[PDB]
Amino acid sequence: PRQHLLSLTRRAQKHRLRELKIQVKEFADKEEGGDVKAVCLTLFLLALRARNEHRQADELEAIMQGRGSGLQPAVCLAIRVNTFLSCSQYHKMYR
DNA sequence: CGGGTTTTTGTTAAGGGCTGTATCACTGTGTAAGACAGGCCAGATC
Structure with a gap:
């Protein structure tokens, strides 16, 4: 039974988003150089500014x-x- | 009350990298005057 995305644990979320992970990484290292984190935070900032926050x-x-x-x-x-x-x-x- | 079905949760191995903790050989604060026994000269003395 599905409950919610962020309700899962880290390993379960990875199991659930492995497909999107592979797709984004391949479509980012084909032409965009290969910096996955760059494309990730860029897309996140764009989707967040879509809500003009x-x-x-x-x-x-x-x-x-x-x-x-x-x-x-x-x-x-x-x-x-x-x-x-x-x-x-x-x-x-610091402790 | 179970199959069929579904979403969570470990599990192995090897390697990388960040974080926390034990270990080493040491320190700085416990610090000034007084009681007393022995020797010795100046001096009253019988």
Whole structure:
């Protein structure tokens, strides 16, 4: 009995979308170079802007570009150094 | 109360990559004065 897509587990969702996975990967590496993740997030942003949710698309662009809700290692290194944090104290703080 | 049928859930093997944890040899905080026995000279003395 079918219930819903996101109600399944990871392996079950993979079993259910293996066909679309193969199709998208082949039709993306035929002509579009082969970057599967690129075509994936591009199609997702397009389907999301179809619902004109500018906010969600901007947040996803920020996440996938590293500029919000998550720091690149250089910035947190500068924070760990310029604030005189130790390696164990930063660890506790990060733990 | 089971077949027929369907959607979830493991299961093996080998390799890759990110995350967490044990291990090594060490540290910094326990830090100033007083009690007492022995020697010794200045001096009252009988």
